[PDB]
Each structure stands twice: as structure tokens, then as C-alpha cells.
Amino acid sequence: GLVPRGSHMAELRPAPPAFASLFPPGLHAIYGECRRLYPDQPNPLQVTAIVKYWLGGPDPLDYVSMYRNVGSPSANIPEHWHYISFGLSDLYGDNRVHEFTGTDGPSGFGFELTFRLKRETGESAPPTWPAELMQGLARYVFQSENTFCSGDHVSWHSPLDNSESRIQHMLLTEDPQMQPVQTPFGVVTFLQIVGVCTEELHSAQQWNGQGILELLRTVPIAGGPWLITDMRRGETIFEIDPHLQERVDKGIETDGSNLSGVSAKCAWDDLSRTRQLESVHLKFNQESGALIPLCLRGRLLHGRHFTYKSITGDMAITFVSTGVEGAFATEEHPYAAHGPWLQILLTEEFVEKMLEDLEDLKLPKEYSWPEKKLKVSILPDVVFDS
């Protein structure tokens, strides 16, 4: 036989910081993860709060580091500014702002904020406005002590850079590069801010945040696997691609809807200390009517409830399934009202039947199921405004 020749490989594929004793261990651990990603930028531009939060200052974030990330146009990831906060987790461990809780569990709130902003031509330095955006979000978190996690939305209702931009709200996702770190003061994760349009915010609310985040990943301009925010983006993902709405629709059906209620134009009528009603008539305008499929397919079909509240007045309709506790409507008396608040119980089988008729979304458009003694009508706006 032949003597072994050895393998020939055809394709070869691609220290503490100075004065380490000066760094508090929580800060040290975040900085270490930053160092791993940016060995070439050991001294990034930073915004720092001179008047400290624990001495009466307004800004909870002690530091925001601002890095340049070359990205990978080879993978459709554009060049961008990468922002990382210091102060939401326990940096110092000495009870000045967070309670010291040991190595187990979250350090402070358990995360820092990050952000990725698409670089414009002629930008030789990271804009500083995102630091103040981050301060505002952190203020929100410090006031309520409500913790954010991956998939949450933030209704912000203002252009993020105070321009005229359409990016007006935020979702939160895991940073695509930054790994969680264990510190003497607890575990720290990295939550990335993703800018969105109102319509995209509305969709996360109707379906779930993880679902919209995953759609944003498939649209580079929105966009991209690393979820970079472009403040100049003029179109929604649904304007760029009409086929995405269908994924949202299917998602709501499969996962369920995170929307439990809406304020809208609507009314209910009786057709004959809660009262039980033999017959009932439900009235919606076009917009509130368009949510009925979401109500039925994304809520009742998942054992949940959904409330329509009247924009003007005390009137309300809550749909309930056989799964909920504490309802005053039951299978035997499925229409019941406490004052102007109607509850309506529908079984799985009957909502399936209603859905056969209920598409979409010439008024008045009236639906009827005489055996159930139920009518639903879509009416012109004038009915509800007067």
C-alpha cells in the first residue's frame, strides 16, 4: 500500500486594561465585551454625565460609548455607529444606585441599552443625539422600575432625532454581537433599540414584537440581520412589501394576538346585578370592524378575551371564549351586560362559522345569525359621532 501523505488543507478560513484597579468591576465587564468587538478602537468617543444621577443629576446613564462598525456589505450589513450604555446595570456594587444582590440574578436592571445608527456620507464622527435618546429611555426605566426584555415596544410618539423623520417609536431586541456577561454584581444582557414607524409599532402590538423584529430582518432598508436603524427611511415595511401583511395575518392566527383591547367607534343594542339578554346587535365603523378577525382568530380562538371600548361614552363590548374565568356571560346566557358594558361569549365552533362570513376586513353592511339571535353591522362614521 501507500504511505500516509498527510492532509493538505485546501481552504484556510479567516490582557487587562491599563490601570485596571481604577475600573469598577461592573463597568470593567461591559468594557471587556466592548473591547472584544472593537480591539481597534480602545478610546472611543463617549458622552459622560458629569453631574451624577445619585447626586441629583437628571441622567441615569453614566457613560455612552460610541463606536464605528464597518459592517459587512458582503452580507448586506451597512456601516453604522454602535452605541452602548453604562448605568442600567450595577457598575459599582456599593449600593449608590442599585441594590447590591450578589453574583446571582440580574445586575441592577439586568441589561444595558445599545443602538445601531446607519452612517451618513460626510459623518466622520458619531452623532451624539442617540445618547440623549438612551438617557430618556433609561429615565423611563428608573422611574417605574419596569424592566424591558427582547420583543417589547416603546410608544415614543416623537421622531427619535427630533427631526421630521418617520421613525418615531422603538422595539427592543438582543444585540446581535454583544454577549451576556457575568460580573460580581450579577448577569448583564444587551438590549438593542430598533427604530420603527407607527404602523410597525401597531403591528407588534397586534401580533408580537419578536414577529415584527423577524420581518424587519428581511428588509435591508428597515432593516437587516443586525437591525440597523436608518432615520431617513420614508416607507414602512408594508409599503416596501405588500406580501408582509400576510405573514402578520398568519402569525396572529398561529401565535395569537397580544392586543387585548382597543378604543374605537362602536355600540351595542338590545333586541328584546347584570342583565341577561336574549338577543343583541353589535355595531362598528369600518376601522373597528376591520379588527373583528383579529378579535376572533387571534384572541377567542386562543382562549382569550378582547375589549372594544367606545371612544365617546361608557359603552363597551368584551368578547370572551369558554376558557376565561370571572365572566358574567356563559354558554347558557352568552349575552350579558353590566350597565353599558356588554360581555359576549362565543364557542370555538361558532366563531369558526362567523369567520366564514366575516371577510373583509357599501355601508351599512349587516351580518346575521338568527339561530344565535346575533347581528353585527358595519356602519358609516356619522352614526357614532352623533
From Swiss-Prot:
Entry-annotated residues carrying Phosphoserine: S386
What is the location of the Glycyl lysine isopeptide (Lys-Gly) (interchain with G-Cter in ubiquitin) cross-link?
A: K250
Q: In which tissues is it expressed?
A: Ubiquitous in adult tissues. Detected in osteoblasts of the perichondrium in the developing limb of 12-week old embryos. Isoform 1 is detected in fetal brain, lung, kidney and testis. Isoform 2 is detected in fetal testis, and at much lower levels in fetal brain, lung and kidney.
The compartments listed are: Cytoplasm; Nucleus
Q: Which GO terms describe its biological process?
A: aorta development; coronary vasculature development; heart looping; negative regulation of osteoblast differentiation; negative regulation of protein import into nucleus; negative regulation of smoothened signaling pathway; negative regulation of transcription by RNA polymerase II; negative regulation of ubiquitin-dependent protein catabolic process
Which clinical disorder is mentioned?
Medulloblastoma: Malignant, invasive embryonal tumor of the cerebellum with a preferential manifestation in children. Joubert syndrome 32: A form of Joubert syndrome, a disorder presenting with cerebellar ataxia, oculomotor apraxia, hypotonia, neonatal breathing abnormalities and psychomotor delay. Neuroradiologically, it is characterized by cerebellar vermian hypoplasia/aplasia, thickened and reoriented superior cerebellar peduncles, and an abnormally large interpeduncular fossa, giving the appearance of a molar tooth on transaxial slices (molar tooth sign). Additional variable features include retinal dystrophy, renal disease, liver fibrosis, and polydactyly. JBTS32 inheritance is autosomal recessive.
This protein's assembly is summarised as: May form homodimers. Part of a DNA-bound corepressor complex containing SAP18, GLI1 and SIN3. Part of a complex containing CTNNB1. Binds BTRC, GLI2, GLI3, SAP18 and STK36. Binds both free and DNA-bound GLI1. Interacts with KIF7. Interacts with GLI3FL and this interaction regulates the formation of either repressor or activator forms of GLI3. Its association with GLI3FL is regulated by Hh signaling and dissociation of the SUFU-GLI3 interaction requires the presence of the ciliary motor KIF3A. Interacts with ULK3; inactivating the protein kinase activity of ULK3. Interacts with RAB23.
Please identify the protein, giving its name as recorded: Suppressor of fused homolog
Name the source organism.
Answer: Homo sapiens
